Design a protein around this ligand. Structure first.
Ligand SMILES: Nc1ncnc2c1ncn2[C@@H]1O[C@H](COP(=O)(O)OP(=O)(O)OP(=O)(O)O)[C@@H](O)[C@H]1O
Ligand SMILES: Nc1ncnc2c1ncn2[C@@H]1O[C@H](COP(=O)(O)OP(=O)(O)OP(=O)(O)O)[C@@H](O)[C@H]1O
Ligand SMILES: Nc1ncnc2c1ncn2[C@@H]1O[C@H](COP(=O)(O)OP(=O)(O)OP(=O)(O)O)[C@@H](O)[C@H]1O
Ligand SMILES: [Mg+2]
Ligand SMILES: [Mg+2]
Ligand SMILES: [Mg+2]
Lengths: 401, 398, 441, 193, 104
């Protein structure tokens, strides 16, 4: 019966299996070189040694090796914009430390890991930490009690435990008891707990954490700066290996046009994959520069001029008249009645007749659906406020040119 | 199709084009329905009764499953889905459980069967203007319920408004708008004359008066009476129920020179203009205590007489707000007997508030602290009637 | 009779092609090939992708996904190595409801015939544990997120973060395909969700902005196709029903038209669409809305009038349905009012023209109306209560809106323009000349 | 006398779409007429012509609470003549509960509103529209407790709500008249020392 | 990055030349587009510009007051202008952008 199966699931005795394919997967020898480049340029394929993150690797490795060898416990906070190699470098450090512990060069340790965005409440961190120790799924009150009995009571031989906490800003709330508990347990001498906390903003400990939590969080911090155009090219030409599938100027264009916007590594490794997919359907074996140009135009999209050009005739007269009412009144927020007056003026100039204000309200709702304009519910006709979401110069670029 | 239209045209005169359009769209059950119909009109144009008769006739003659709602009883969406799935999946009993829109669509998808039986579903949602004041995924889902359930169904909406009051920030699907125009004078005369046989059979049951009744109560007599009735009553209302309800009583008053023995238009044109003054009242002297009367006229003088003027009047557009201290000051100014403040006077203030003769425009959480503001909610004629029954003139203090 | 039944079959065929037929599309050669190649590379090679179908409402976004899935699903290499999870932002209003639907549709070990056990956190942990334990040997999951902008409104975007995070991890090969109508849905995402999203965005702006493409579409939507094309489409629909919309589809195999009937109907349709009146009506519709849903609404209203007494489509019928489409409806509500409400609306228009759209009241409009009614000699005997009930009839029909106080003293706004009232004065039947003279001044 | 007229009104509706309703022009003093309504329920339960729910103004702050107390009052009333949780008190359960018992027999469903002026206006209008929507299926009679005058009824009921209303006015005696009757027949009676 | 440099320079220019410091995202994007079109660099649309300002918010230079629509989000500079001049370290570009009042 499924209820016994769920009681086995909460006990952790039955593996959460997933369905298997009926057909065997494709072999590596059948793949083309463009296909090998497209599967090496994936963002899920992490390298064993990350390029251009050697100094941060040395910093986190020296920190965690020192806290393991001294058997003391403490805390760390690494930060940076997304895509900058934080979680990959931290898990690479911990994989290197576990390889050292399996070769008896380091004392053995436990590695628990949670994520702030994989939880439905911040209180479920107690459930997910305790699940990775025993396997049992319990309530968060009993899990909190068992974790406090584990960490606050001295019991030789306690093994060192390393708790990585991704997305620390989600574990914060108003009361801040979960983050206080996770950063307060290293302060006790009975707990050999080393906490690494990953978040995005650099000033998270002073912005939204309290004073005692910022005191416990320490000052041993690391920042992951965004990738420059040299580093973000080195990453992609490391992923390609020794292959000659990509031109040298194409990767330089990808790095120069991604590093100027965000410094994300996922953005570059997705634009190069899209360029490979463009070069595949063009029946060529190399990814030249115009394939990268088409991929850069597709991924970094700007499709509001295409929407205004493909609007209907009455929609374009309405879009001209909202900008005319903005120019006339000066303010950016216009009521529907002045817009309809300018609509009838522009339609009288253009030689067309316009629909009545009901179908004009339908046009306003249709443009507000595309978010070309911002408009209210149509229950307040003739007095609803109409913001112009597109700029007024894009309308004149689309309807003249 | 033609059986439904041939059945509905007797009961609904002057609506042949609307019945014909609804028979074009959702008449036959074998042909596919449009995703939604929105018929609208004024009050009394017959959109609840026509869709009820259409849904009953379709469920009688064909394989359709109908569901007529009212959006006022559906204060949350679970009520609407429970009525909808009770009607569209009948004989489910007390085992029916609907949680949300997803479970409603998932249980409606199971109702699909083979195409040999030609089944359909029809949903009429009366008073559809309430759907925009609820959970904001009800009206977008109901306009595409045929696409979601992959089933031959139509969602009819009934309101007094155009569909241009219904567009929201997210956009809506296509709808087939239909108009029920209100009748002119000739169509309303035909509707009022369609029950001439029911009128004659009611009057023949209610003995010289019966033999003078049946010799002339005929078609042209009732048509001329309805002509004289609509000559004075069509100016104020075109509502067919109010005109029927007033025409019955005015016929009961009009028959008397014919029963007892032009030449009738004046004798009814008296009572016709007496009964015109009580249109929209559907009917088939406020005594108060003495200090309640003084407190009520003091509240009227406080709400009317421009509180800067109270220095000149008492020391010896909208109704203005006043505090309880100003009301008691005007009470002690106009009383001229100086009764002491007790429990019963301020209790009379509170029970005049509870009788809706006064009201609380502001405050109402701090009635005792002096920051509460009241306003009087009566007219001058009632105040003058109170001043007549008291002996205190108000127009000197006005 | 036999000639009466062939028109019944033609009307049923055209109605079923207009409302149903969720699979076949017209146009979109590059975008459909993009989506088809993306889902094929997800299902075959085990790649994890993400996509964002974008476009206006009414363009064929759902029809494109139905076409791509109906072309891929009878392959039995797609259909046996891939399970598909459909989610809707209107139906799955929370991450709890969406997650229980994901747990049911993937047939997980705690599903047990549509009744998921455990809390929301247990369902999330079991789903992430199931997807993390898989790999290239596992079945591909294809998530389809319709109304994708409403999934961004959920708390903390946990479902969007977890569906995009599996696409960037060494886990089960999933594909996240969002479909939404907003063109700037990517600024609704949080920066982590925006970082994990692969920014490929397919736009579906409709390719019938030119009027001749609109006329060609209206011709192809009314013509009767050849029997060989009907046989090919019926074979495709039978292969789709052999393996969701497939239960009640078009199924064009039940309809069979003789070649004389097809040639006569297509000749009459081309002859009508060559005229100037039908092209003027379609020009009015194309000037309003170039979407295919608007044209299909027009053609459904036109096909439904094919009674056996009038078997042909003609340009005057198209002109009648276009005149039905083009009219104002608040003018039709204004002509249904009695003369008392019309005099009240004339007094409201007079007050609004004098005081430059200032707010009015029942007392102000009753004063301005009583100044007319004493000298009108048709409105002398009206009580105050009847005019108040007429004011309430104007208020509940939303020709008067409040500024959102007693019922006779609330301030209001006129919801009409002056042109609508001026056209109502011309279209009104049996309006007395006293009111028509008071309306001009 | 007014009791007999109200019972004849309810029975004459039982002998027989707008709901029939009965405005009772009672006095200023609201605590005095709860005994009048209790006697009306006792006379309606004596003939078994109807079953009565009394909707106080304190129970009807919203439309949800008004419909819930209405269905709960009618269900518990018929339960007490010969229990559902209040969140399960819907109009569909009232229809099924009426179809189970009294469709085989026609028992009216009298709804007293003793303090008509204290009710919320919008909740009252929606309640009257709901009770008017269920006519034919469920027989509803709506006796009222209007205290001031009929102008309050004609003012708080708009154009659309009053069109579904078939009211008939009754008049209770004035409070000084009842005082003079008590003062002449009790406090001046010779039998009391 | 270059686009965050151009965003910060237009925010400093808009705060220097205007005494109303209630800057919306669309009003900032309109000045950013003209500054980019003056230097003949292709400007981002509103959808990438919102993510760019969101990435500058993480450094602590800004604080974005959230509203109902992403066009109406209010940017609030939380550094003084000399810290921005020292942090951008591209004074040849900063002095070129601050002297161009005409694109506002
Ligand atoms: N220096 C690098 N060399 C090679 N690949 C990299 C490098 N940095 C990042 N990547 C790739 O980019 C992806 C970045 O994901 P990662 O877990 O590093 O995000 P993050 O930096 O932790 O930020 P966030 O989790 O906030 O998005 C990884 O899948 C990794 O394969
Ligand atoms: N054309 C007609 N012929 C005969 N009777 C009619 C006609 N139109 C309406 N009626 C009668 O009028 C009565 C009330 O009409 P109905 O309640 O359908 O109007 P409604 O549009 O529902 O009003 P509301 O908008 O207030 O809900 C019905 O009993 C119906 O029989
Ligand atoms: N390219 C096309 N090919 C075939 N049919 C189309 C096309 N574009 C629009 N349609 C028709 O227009 C209507 C639009 O429906 P569809 O579901 O495809 O659009 P949608 O964008 O998903 O709508 P929504 O966003 O409101 O769900 C359908 O009836 C469809 O048949
Ligand atoms: Mg991470
Ligand atoms: Mg109705
Ligand atoms: Mg769709």
């Amino acid at each position: 019966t499924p209820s016994q199966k769920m009681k086995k699931i909460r006990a952790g005795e039955l593996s959460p299996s997933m369905q298997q394919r009926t057909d065997l997967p494709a072999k590596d020898s059948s793949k083309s070189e463009l296909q090998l480049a497209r599967e090496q340029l994936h963002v899920s394929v992490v390298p064993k040694s990350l390029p251009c993150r050697e100094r941060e690797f040395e910093n986190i490795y020296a920190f965690l090796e020192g806290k393991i060898q001294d058997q003391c416990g403490g805390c760390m906070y690494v930060s940076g914009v997304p895509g900058t190699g934080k979680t990959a470098t931290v898990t690479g450090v911990i994989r290197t430390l576990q390889r050292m512990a399996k070769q008896n060069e380091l004392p053995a340790f436990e590695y628990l890991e949670i994520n702030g965005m994989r939880l439905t409440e911040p209180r479920q961190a107690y459930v997910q930490i305790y699940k990775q120790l025993t396997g049992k799924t319990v309530s968060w009150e009993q899990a909190h009690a068992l974790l406090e009995k584990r960490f606050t009571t001295p019991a030789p031989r306690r093994v060192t435990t390393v708790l990585l906490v991704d997305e620390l800003d989600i574990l914060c709330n108003r009361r801040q008891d979960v983050v206080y508990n996770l950063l307060d347990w290293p302060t006790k001498s009975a707990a050999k707990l080393v906490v690494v906390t990953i978040a995005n903003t650099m000033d998270l400990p002073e912005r939204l954490l309290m004073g005692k939590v910022t005191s416990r969080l320490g000052l041993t911090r690391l920042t992951f700066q965004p990738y420059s155009h040299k580093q973000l090219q080195e990453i992609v030409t490391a992923r390609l290996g020794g292959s000659e599938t990509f031109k040298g100027e194409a990767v330089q264009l990808v790095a120069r046009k991604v590093a100027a916007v965000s410094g994300d590594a996922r953005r570059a490794l997705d634009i190069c994959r899209r360029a490979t997919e463009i070069a595949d359907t063009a029946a060529v074996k190399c990814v030249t520069m115009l394939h990268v140009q088409q991929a850069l135009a597709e991924m970094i999209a700007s499709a509001k001029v295409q929407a205004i050009r493909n609007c209907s005739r009455m929609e374009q007269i309405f879009l001209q008249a909202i900008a005319a009412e903005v120019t006339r009144t000066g303010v950016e927020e216009t009521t529907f009645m002045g817009v309809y007056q300018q609509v009838e003026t522009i339609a009288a100039f253009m030689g067309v007749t316009f629909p009545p204000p009901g179908r004009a309200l339908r046009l306003c709702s249709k443009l507000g659906a595309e978010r070309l304009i911002i408009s209210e519910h149509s229950r307040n006709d003739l007095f609803q406020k109409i913001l112009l979401n597109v700029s007024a110069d894009d309308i004149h670029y689309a309807l003249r040119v | 199709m033609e059986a439904i239209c041939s059945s509905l045209e007797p009961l609904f005169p002057c609506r042949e084009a609307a019945i014909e359009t609804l028979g074009e769209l959702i008449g036959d059950s074998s042909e596919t329905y449009p995703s939604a119909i929105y018929l609208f009109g004024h009050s009394g144009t017959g959109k609840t009764a026509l869709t009820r008769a259409f849904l009953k006739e379709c469920g009688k003659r064909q394989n359709v499953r109908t569901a007529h709602l009212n959006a006022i009883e559906c204060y949350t969406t679970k009520i609407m889905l429970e009525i909808l799935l009770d009607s569209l999946a009948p004989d489910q009993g007390d085992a029916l459980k609907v949680d949300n829109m997803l479970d409603f669509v998932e249980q409606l998808r199971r109702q699909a069967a083979t195409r040999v039986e030609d089944q359909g579903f029809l949903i009429a949602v009366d008073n559809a203007e309430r759907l925009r004041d609820m959970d904001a995924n009800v009206l977008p889902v109901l306009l595409r319920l045929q696409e979601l359930t992959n089933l031959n169904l139509c969602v009819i909406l009934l309101s007094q408004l155009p569909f241009e009051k219904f567009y929201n920030k997210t956009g809506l699907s296509e709808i087939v708008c239909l108009h029920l125009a209100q009748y002119n004078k000739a169509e309303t005369q035909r509707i009022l004359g369609s029950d001439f046989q029911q009128v004659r059979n009611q009057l023949l049951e209610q003995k010289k008066r019966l033999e003078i009744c049946q010799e002339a109560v005929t078609e042209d007599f009732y048509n001329n009476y309805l002509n004289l009735f609509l000559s004075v009553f069509y100016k104020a209302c075109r509502d067919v129920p109010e005109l029927q309800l007033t025409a019955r009583k005015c016929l009961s008053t009009y028959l008397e020179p014919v029963l007892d023995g032009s030449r009738l238009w004046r004798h009814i044109a008296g009572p016709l203009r007496s009964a015109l003054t009580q249109i929209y009242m559907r009917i088939e002297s406020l005594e108060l205590p003495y200090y309640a009367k003084f407190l009520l006229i003091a509240a009227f003088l406080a709400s009317h007489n421009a509180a800067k003027q109270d220095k000149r009047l008492f020391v010896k557009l909208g109704p203005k707000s006043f505090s309880i201290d100003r009301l008691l000051a005007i009470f002690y100014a106009i009383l001229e007997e100086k009764v002491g403040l007790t429990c019963n006077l301020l209790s009379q203030i509170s029970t005049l508030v509870h009788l809706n003769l006064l009201s609380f425009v502001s405050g109402e959480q701090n009635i005792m602290e002096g920051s509460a503001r009241l306003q009087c909610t009566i007219g001058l004629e009632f105040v003058l009637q109170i001043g007549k029954v008291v002996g205190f003139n108000v127009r000197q203090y006005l | 009779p036999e000639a009466d039944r062939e028109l019944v079959s033609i009307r049923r065929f055209l109605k079923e092609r207009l409302q149903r037929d969720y699979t076949t599309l017209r146009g979109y050669a590059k975008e459909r090939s993009n989506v088809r190649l993306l889902l094929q590379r997800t299902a075959e090679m085990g790649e994890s992708n993400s996509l964002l179908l974008l476009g206006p409402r009414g363009s064929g976004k759902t029809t494109l996904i139905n076409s791509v899935l109906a072309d891929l699903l009878p392959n039995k290499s797609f259909g046996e190595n891939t399970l598909i999870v459909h989610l809707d932002g209107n139906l799955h209003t929370d991450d709890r409801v969406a997650l229980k639907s994901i747990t049911v549709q993937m047939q997980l070990e705690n599903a047990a015939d549509g009744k998921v056990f455990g809390s929301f956190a247990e369902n999330l942990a079991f789903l992430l544990q199931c997807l993390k334990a898989g790999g290239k040997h596992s079945k591909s999951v294809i998530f389809i997120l319709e109304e994708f902008d409403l999934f961004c409104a959920h708390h903390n975007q946990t479902l969007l973060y977890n569906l995009f995070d599996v696409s960037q991890s060494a886990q089960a090969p999933i594909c996240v395909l969002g479909v939404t109508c907003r063109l700037d849905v990517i600024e609704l995402l949080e920066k982590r969700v925006k970082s994990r999203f692969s920014h490929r965005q397919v736009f579906l702006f409709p390719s019938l902005r030119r009027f001749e493409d609109y006329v060609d579409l209206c011709r192809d939507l009314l013509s009767l196709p050849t029997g060989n094309s009907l046989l090919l489409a019926a074979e495709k629909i039978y292969n789709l029903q052999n393996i969701y919309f497939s239960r009640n589809h078009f199924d064009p195999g039940e309809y069979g038209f003789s070649p004389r009937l097809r040639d006569a109907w297509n000749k009459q349709i081309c002859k009508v669409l060559a005229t100037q009146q039908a092209r003027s009506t379609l020009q009015a519709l194309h000037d309003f809305d170039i979407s295919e849903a608007y044209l299909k609404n027009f053609l459904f209203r036109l096909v439904a009038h094919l009674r056996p007494q009038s078997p042909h489509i003609t340009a005057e019928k198209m002109a009648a349905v276009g005149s039905q489409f083009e009219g104002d409806d608040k003018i039709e509500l204004l002509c249904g009012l009695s003369v008392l409400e019309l005099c009240l609306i004339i007094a409201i228009k007079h007050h609004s023209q004098i005081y430059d759209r200032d707010s009015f009241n029942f007392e102000i409009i009753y004063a301005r109306f009583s100044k007319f009614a004493k000298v009108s000699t048709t409105m002398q005997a009206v009580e105050r209560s009847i005019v108040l009930k007429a004011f309430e009839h104007l208020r509940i029909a939303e020709l008067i809106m409040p500024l959102t106080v007693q019922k006779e003293f609330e301030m209001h706004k006129l919801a009409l323009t002056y042109s609508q009232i001026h056209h109502c004065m011309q279209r009104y039947q049996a309006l007395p000349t006293e009111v028509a003279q008071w309306a001009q001044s | 006398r007014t009791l007999e007229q109200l019972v004849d009104f309810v029975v004459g509706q039982a002998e027989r779409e707008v709901l029939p309703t009965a405005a009772l022009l009672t006095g200023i003093n609201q605590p005095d007429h709860l005994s009048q309504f209790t006697a009306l329920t006792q006379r309606l339960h004596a003939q078994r012509a109807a079953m009565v729910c009394v909707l106080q103004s304190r129970d009807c702050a919203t439309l949800k609470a008004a419909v819930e107390t209405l269905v709960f009052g009618l269900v518990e009333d018929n339960a007490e003549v010969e229990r559902l949780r209040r969140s399960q008190c819907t109009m569909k359960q009232l229809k099924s509960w009426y179809t189970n018992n009294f469709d085989s027999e026609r028992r009216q469903l009298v709804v007293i509103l003793p303090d008509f002026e204290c009710f919320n206006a919008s909740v009252l209008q929606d309640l009257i529209l709901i009770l008017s929507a269920h006519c034919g299926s469920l027989p509803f009679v709506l006796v009222l407790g209007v205290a001031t005058a009929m102008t309050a009824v004609h003012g708080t009921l708009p154009y659309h709500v009053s069109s579904k209303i078939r009211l008939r006015v009754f008049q209770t005696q004035a409070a000084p008249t009842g005082l003079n009757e008590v003062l002449d027949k009790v406090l001046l009676s010779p039998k009391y020392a | 990055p270059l686009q965050q440099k151009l965003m910060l320079c237009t925010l400093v220019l808009m705060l220097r030349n205007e005494r109303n410091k209630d800057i919306s995202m669309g009003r900032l994007h309109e000045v950013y587009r003209r500054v980019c079109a003056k230097r003949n660099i292709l400007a981002l649309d509103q959808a990438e510009f919102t993510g760019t300002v969101d990435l500058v918010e993480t450094r602590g230079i800004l604080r974005i007051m959230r509203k109902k629509e992403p066009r109406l989000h209010k940017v609030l500079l939380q550094w003084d202008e000399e810290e921005v001049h020292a942090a951008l370290s591209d004074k040849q570009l900063i002095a070129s952008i601050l002297s161009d009042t005409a694109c506002l």
